[PDB]
Amino acid sequence: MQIFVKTLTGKTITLEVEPSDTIENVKAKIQDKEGIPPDQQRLIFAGRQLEDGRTLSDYNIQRESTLHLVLRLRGG
Amino acid sequence: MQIFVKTLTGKTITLEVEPSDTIENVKAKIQDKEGIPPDQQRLIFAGKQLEDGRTLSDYNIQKESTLHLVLR
Amino acid sequence: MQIFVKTLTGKTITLEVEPSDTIENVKAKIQDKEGIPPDQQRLIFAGRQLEDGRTLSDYNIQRESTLHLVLRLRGG
């Protein structure tokens, strides 16, 4: 299935994932589409930050759901 | 000065701050107005997480700037 | 009738008003006599702030009444 990742700066990114994929999995896929390293990504759904390890089905993220993406830059 | 704090769930909050206010000071002001403990607050400006120990002027946050708040 | 709008620095503004005059009208009268814009005016009577939509008679402001003027120094 496909999820929609929208940055708070206005960029929308469509990704290819599956319910068994962890949050660390989608972070590695965003690194492909946009080049953001996984250690500097934070994914938001329902106003809460998503944890590396728990899956998309674990957070009740269904098909065509919207995720939010922020940067975590130390020194930034 | 007056800044705006928006959640991604809908609520918009107005805050009275100073340029020399630190990020943790803004979080304590958010806890006062909202009840959210600063432990679970993440402030966002220009698309990136804001660090504790920095000030609002350090990120060039000025009058009527919009910060975003997400729960950790 | 006459009312007296005094500042916290002793400046007394004598205004010729009517009991049916609204607080906005009083502020516009102050702006004419002195030049203080209305949005910069906080008007106090009997220790409480006066609302724009009310009239003078609404606050039992009779003749020879003394009002107090505090400046709203917050610009934009």
Author numbering:
A (entry chain B), C (entry chain C): 1 to 76
B (entry chain A): 1 to 72
Question: How does the study describe this entry?
Answer:
In this K48–K63-branched Ub3 structure, the K48-linked Ub adopts a closed conformation with interactions between the two I44 patches of the distal and proximal moieties, while the K63-linked Ub adopts an open, extended conformation. Previous approaches to generate branched Ub3 used a Ub moiety lacking the C-terminal glycine residues (UbΔC).
Branched Ub chains are formed when two or more sites on a single Ub molecule are modified with Ub, creating distinct bifurcated architectures. Sophisticated mass spectrometry (MS) studies have revealed that a substantial number of K48 and K63 linkages coexist in branched heterotypic chains and these K48–K63-branched Ub chains have been connected to nuclear factor κB (NF-κB) signaling and proteasomal degradation. We engineer a K48–K63 branch-specific nanobody and reveal the molecular basis of its specificity in crystal structures of nanobody-branched Ub chain complexes. The minimal branched Ub chain unit is commonly considered to be made up of three Ub moieties, with two distal Ub moieties linked to a single proximal Ub.
